[PDB]
């Protein structure tokens with residue numbers, strides 16, 4: 001009666017015995033009813049090995065779902081997992097690595113699910129950051145990495161659906177990538193005049209582009225770079241030729257250990273099975289096998305698939321969109337600090353963006369800050385006819401168009417660490433209008 | 438040295454003819470000792486075993502490219518999917534000879550897929566040209582709610598937006614449904630008469646039956662469809678006078694095999710002239726890194742230009758699909774498909790056969806009414 | 813003949829008569845550009861016309877093709893006063909047509 005959930009591991013330093021005595025009799029008293037985990041690891045991630053191990057696993061123990069983890073480097077593993085899930089109708093969840101990168105189209109019979117975000121949500125968060133710092137001018141730089149058209153479509157949709165009328169400058173493309181001639185792309189990189197640049201490329205292409213930009217002088221103050229998770233690569237080891245102040249948006253997994261992620265995925269599967277048991281008297285049917293040909297999908301499989309889309313674990317929203325990815329997750333805007341470490345900068349709650357820096361630190365060389373002489377710090381006080389202070393709209397979290405944002409200090413409460421949420425407010429009035437003019 | 442070419446085929450006759458084609462191809466590219474070898478595998482009943490056979494047999498021979506034509510299954514079976522995934526893990530280019538599915542044009546999912554037959558979604562281009570030849574501006578697009586229907590709709594809408602125009606009404610039905618009466622009743626009230634269809638054979642038969650029942654196939658209408666809708670049992674229920682499309686040498690797998698073999702041979706010979714060339718891996722077990730020259734090989738294959746071929750000149754667009762492919766425009770005159778013109782590349786040429794429209798007389802019907810009553 | 817000051821005066825009269833009151837001054841390090849810029853500024857300051865002189869671009873760099881492109885892109889006017897040698901004029905006009 002225990003839900004047979006199989007956890008399969010990639011090649012991220014393959015070891016599972018050290019993490020085997022932590023789930024057999026665990027994560028069952030937390031909330032799920034009864035689980036039985038089967039752990040098998042693959043030290044090689046080629047398609048033959050993946051198919052062989054998954055098919056041998058599905059040939060015994062009557063598995064209910066599969067939890068997959070990859071490194072980060074490989075990207076065809078997601079498509080292979082989608083193929084297996086469609087051919088066997090077994091629910092598969094992708095936890096981390098390159099397999100967690102979202103495939104926008106999936107096979108109709110596939111139950112493959114990814115704990116990741118589409119490019120549209122990442123672009124939404126990045127444009128929220130741009131609105132927060134009023135960076136209405138930006139330029140889009142893309143490579144010929146597959147999906148660049150999708151990235152441009154998402155950028156266009158976000159810009160049109162917003163209310164700020166963003167100024168989109170000339171769109172640039174990197175042709176050769178790894179085999180860059182350093183002449184044509186150099187000429188294009190020297191032909192830019194934007195203070196904010198949004199880049200689409202893979203990890204290797206990101207390194208090449210950033211090195212060429214460093215040659216072209218697009219690093220340091222006066223230039224900000226925003227990239228999605230594709231260029232991020234491994235968060236624990238930021239490589240050389242990555243400009244300080246690089247901005248990205250990742251889900252709440254970048255500082256979570258492998259055991260936490262695996263137990264989270266098993267919890268999602270168990271919660272879905274528990275909901276199915278609550279509605280349907282019997283447990284969901286296990287997957288049959290790799291062999292034979294399960295052409296169509298039984299309503300038993302479909303009910304299970306629809307019963308694990310809406311799963312809440314430890315107060316975290318793990319709702320899955322019909323495209324098999326998280327629809328309303330809690331995002332985190334991370335940035336590369338002067339110590340060459342990916343540092344948490346902002347949060348994305350239900351619909352609001354919470355930043356940590358009111359002024360973006362523009363490190364010029366290595367660690368040295370700048371002052372941005374054209375920037376002023378203004379101290380005010382609340383007087384009813386002159387400076388009126390109110391709270392921002394809770395639904396949106398932003399300020400009214402006729403107001404401006406304004407925070408407040410406090411006595412004691414040592415704020416050097418900047419691990420302190422804003423008491424963010426909006427100011428309007430006679431003095432504020434004078435200041436705007 | 439020896440360069441291996443892999444093939445996934447249906448019957449051993451095509452295996453032997455592929456061997457003959459590669460043997461002929463290697464005899465016309467210089468007297469230097471450059472040899473092309475051929476490895477061929479039949480299709481497997483199930484996709485997972487098919488992928489395992491691809492990994493054990495084809496990739497273990499260090500094949501520079503893999504050709505997957507089609508199995509004996511009727512149509513629309515997504516059979517080159519396991520081959521595409523397995524050979525795209527290593528970025529080995531895969532040449533498709535028969536499949537016209539619109540999914541394989543997505544390079545984010547299928548990373549190393551080229552094909553010598555254009556996808557079904559490209560048929561919309563032909564329709565656009567027809568809308569210029571007979572001067573039709575108000576059309577009703579009627580597509581299945583699938584990847585194919587949405588792809589055809591997207592391409593047609595892009596072409597119309599290029600012309601600063603729009604479809605009068607876009608209707609979608611779920612595949613396999615039998616209750617399309619509501620949608621056809623909705624389209625009945627529309628002013629446009631030119632109806633453009635994009636659906637599978639059974640769905641085409643269903644919509645044809647519904648239209649015949651709803652008197653939507655009378656005089657004044659125009660029915661523009663594709664290749665799928667005038668094939669199989671959908672031909673039995675098609676209203677007389679329906680304009681359809683066909684692909685010249687679309688099912689001729691021999692000519693496509695020969696043309697693809699020539700293309701692959703020329704691309705390989707051009708590739709060997711460069712430096713930093715790495716042998717493809719025996720990626721059965723022990724290999725996970727991609728083939729380093731795979732992306733460059735695909736770039737050479739796509740950028741390659743040709744002027745000779747059994748199916749004609751081959752040119753691959755930026756998505757890896759065949760471009761400049763001729764079409765044959767067929768008319769259902771007295772329960773028999775009669776060709777009434779050719780789509781040459783980017784133009785439509787009509788022959789001396791009179792077009793018979795789904796009503797009576799051969800006069801060209803303008804595809805819209807006035808709708809004097811207003812709501 | 814006419815000194816550079818008189819040519820500048822005639823140029824300013826041309827701009828005034830056609831109501832081109834918004835303009836940019838683009839000069840090189842070619843000799844005499846200091847006096848040209850000084851006279852243009854002096855005429856603009858002691859005038860009731862309401863001249864809009866913006867983006868005084870002293871190109872200086874000998875067509876390094878790195879700063880010149882951005883320097884020319886910094887101009888958003890409709891009338892450009894160009895002071896440079898004939899060959900420098902050819903180079904700058906070719907770059908402008910490129911931009």
Ligand SMILES: *[C@@H]1O[C@H](CO)[C@@H](O[C@@H]2O[C@H](CO)[C@@H](O[C@H]3O[C@H](CO)[C@@H](O)[C@H](O)[C@@H]3O)[C@H](O)[C@H]2NC(C)=O)[C@H](O)[C@H]1NC(C)=O
Pocket residue numbers: 689690691692747
């Ligand atoms: C698929 O297309 C094929 C080529 O487009 C076609 O094969 C063609 O068949 C004819 C004979 O039936 C060959 O004609 C040759 O024979 C004459 C003497 O009869 C000689 O003078 C020449 O060799 C002449 O070309 C074509 O050469 C041959 N083409 C090739 C190379 O295959 C198939 O019949 C088609 N299959 C179908 C229609 O299902």
Ligand SMILES: *[C@@H]1O[C@H](CO)[C@@H](O[C@@H]2O[C@H](CO)[C@@H](O)[C@H](O)[C@H]2NC(C)=O)[C@H](O)[C@H]1NC(C)=O
Pocket residue numbers: 275279303306307310
């Ligand atoms: C999660 O969503 C599923 C469906 O999306 C819910 O299952 C439905 O439950 C209602 C009432 O319990 C039934 O009338 C429906 O028929 C069910 N749908 C299916 C597809 O079986 C499920 O209750 C939701 N769970 C939570 C916790 O919100």
Ligand SMILES: *[C@@H]1O[C@H](CO)[C@@H](O[C@@H]2O[C@H](CO)[C@@H](O)[C@H](O)[C@H]2NC(C)=O)[C@H](O)[C@H]1NC(C)=O
Pocket residue numbers: 439441474475476477494497498499
């Ligand atoms: C030419 O092709 C044949 C196809 O059978 C090759 O035979 C295979 O060789 C590969 C390695 O290249 C082995 O993995 C298979 O086991 C062989 N299969 C059979 C049935 O022999 C043959 O070796 C190739 N010769 C060359 C490269 O010239």
Ligand SMILES: *[C@@H]1O[C@H](CO)[C@@H](O[C@@H]2O[C@H](CO)[C@@H](O)[C@H](O)[C@H]2NC(C)=O)[C@H](O)[C@H]1NC(C)=O
Pocket residue numbers: 615616617618619620622
């Ligand atoms: C299923 O198809 C049948 C075909 O008879 C539809 O029956 C009629 O459809 C017309 C619309 O053209 C309605 O005005 C009538 O009220 C229907 N009569 C019935 C219900 O017998 C039927 O509507 C279709 N059902 C759908 C599309 O849901």
Ligand SMILES: *[C@@H]1O[C@H](CO)[C@@H](O)[C@H](O)[C@H]1NC(C)=O
Pocket residue numbers: 014041042043044
């Ligand atoms: C890889 O596979 C399993 C462990 O996953 C083990 O039996 C085998 O010896 C491993 N081989 C290597 C070379 O790591």
Ligand SMILES: *[C@@H]1O[C@H](CO)[C@@H](O)[C@H](O)[C@H]1NC(C)=O
Pocket residue numbers: 410411412
């Ligand atoms: C007000 O805040 C300042 C901040 O340094 C602190 O020094 C001071 O003690 C505070 N006043 C009181 C009354 O706590």
Ligand SMILES: *[C@@H]1O[C@H](CO)[C@@H](O)[C@H](O)[C@H]1NC(C)=O
Pocket residue numbers: 651652653655
């Ligand atoms: C169909 O309905 C009747 C015959 O069934 C006929 O009078 C009418 O003209 C036809 N046209 C339509 C679409 O009503």
Ligand SMILES: *[C@@H]1O[C@H](CO)[C@@H](O)[C@H](O)[C@H]1NC(C)=O
Pocket residue numbers: 748749750761762763781782
């Ligand atoms: C199609 O036929 C036309 C008309 O002769 C010709 O111009 C063109 O080359 C052909 N294109 C092909 C072979 O697709």
Ligand SMILES: *[C@@H]1O[C@H](CO)[C@@H](O)[C@H](O)[C@H]1NC(C)=O
Pocket residue numbers: 761781782783784785786
């Ligand atoms: C045939 O095709 C070519 C290229 O597609 C085109 O340029 C030519 O005009 C076409 N011929 C006719 C008759 O239009």
